[PDB]
Amino acid sequence: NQSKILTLQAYDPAKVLVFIGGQRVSGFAADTKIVITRNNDNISVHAGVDGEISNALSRDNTGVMTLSLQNTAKWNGYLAQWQRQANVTGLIYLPVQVEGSQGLSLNTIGWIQKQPDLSYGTEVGQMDWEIGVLDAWLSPDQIQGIA
């Protein structure tokens, strides 16, 4: 029914901006651009023998962010240099930002957690870089009307 159109402007995936270290990322893969996850659930429940229930608030909010890039992309070079930079000098952190075109944003600092699996074949491959983000609270700021 036309009275329940959830998006009056078509969702254009190109509006989703990602900035790492202050430069705009580009050269993404075929299907998925990014994935953001947490490691720990929000609260812990300790239920007693007779049904007494008490809850605790978590204090580890770190998450992991995956970034799919075609292995022919130029940005593979910048990340590869950065790994060695941090391994020797010991400076790992780097600002990270995400723009939620019509969804949830993100703005924190992160570091390269692991390097992907490089494979060469008859087709242009793919790479999944893991950018661990220090704090992973999604922000609704892009949405209007949030009272």
Binding site: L17, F19, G22, R24, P95, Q97, E99, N107
Partner: protein
């Protein structure tokens, strides 16, 4: 100046109650102190065997700490924006007025001043009760909202920031009570207070 020169503004620390070698305790009476305070003429008291500056109020009545904090924030924001912009224009690839390039100012500002102020404790954070968060806010306009004259002059206006500030403690009051006989039994209404 020597008691304030190396103090880092980002901590929001207060000039109140600091010791300043070289000066001598003020010898006026209580009413003289009250008058001097009415004039915002800071004095140097001597208490409990030492000395102490008092309240560091400026001429206009505002606390000196807020003034120093505001100046520090202003200077470092200008510095941080200019440094990024120049470095980004020295490789070619100069910044451009577009919806795809302006948002990065959020990270630029959030990085240098704000994330140091929060760590040192000058800038406040959390949630209130007013029922509104204390967290810093950054807002940047889109291209659609930029006037023709602003485009012609190639300058961006109306970037808005918002912060909250801590408060050093100056005065404290106490209410003691002494009992000589046996105190009487308390109320025994062991309910949950509504």
């Amino acid at each position: 100046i020597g008691a304030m020169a190396a103090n880092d503004p980002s901590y929001g620390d207060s000039l109140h109650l600091k010791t300043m070698p070289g000066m001598v305790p003020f010898a006026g009476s209580d009413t003289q102190r009250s008058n001097a305070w009415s004039r915002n003429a800071n004095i140097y008291r001597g208490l409990y065997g030492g000395g102490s500056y008092i309240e560091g109020k400026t001429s206009s009545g505002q606390y000196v700490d807020v003034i120093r904090f505001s100046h520090w924030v202003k200077f470092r924001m200008e510095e941080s924006v200019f440094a990024y912009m120049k470095r980004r224009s020295d490789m070619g690839l100069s910044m451009k007025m577009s919806d795809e390039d302006l948002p990065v100012l959020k990270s630029v500002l959030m990085n240098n001043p704000i994330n140091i102020g929060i760590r040192n404790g000058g800038i406040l954070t959390g949630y209130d009760t007013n029922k509104v968060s204390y967290d810093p806010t950054i807002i940047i306009p889109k291209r659609a909202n930029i006037p023709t004259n602003d485009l012609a002059a190639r300058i961006l206006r109306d970037v808005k920031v918002e912060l909250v500030y801590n408060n050093s403690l100056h005065y404290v009051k106490i209410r003691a009570s002494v009992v000589l006989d046996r105190p009487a039994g308390q109320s025994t209404n062991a309910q949950t207070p509504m």
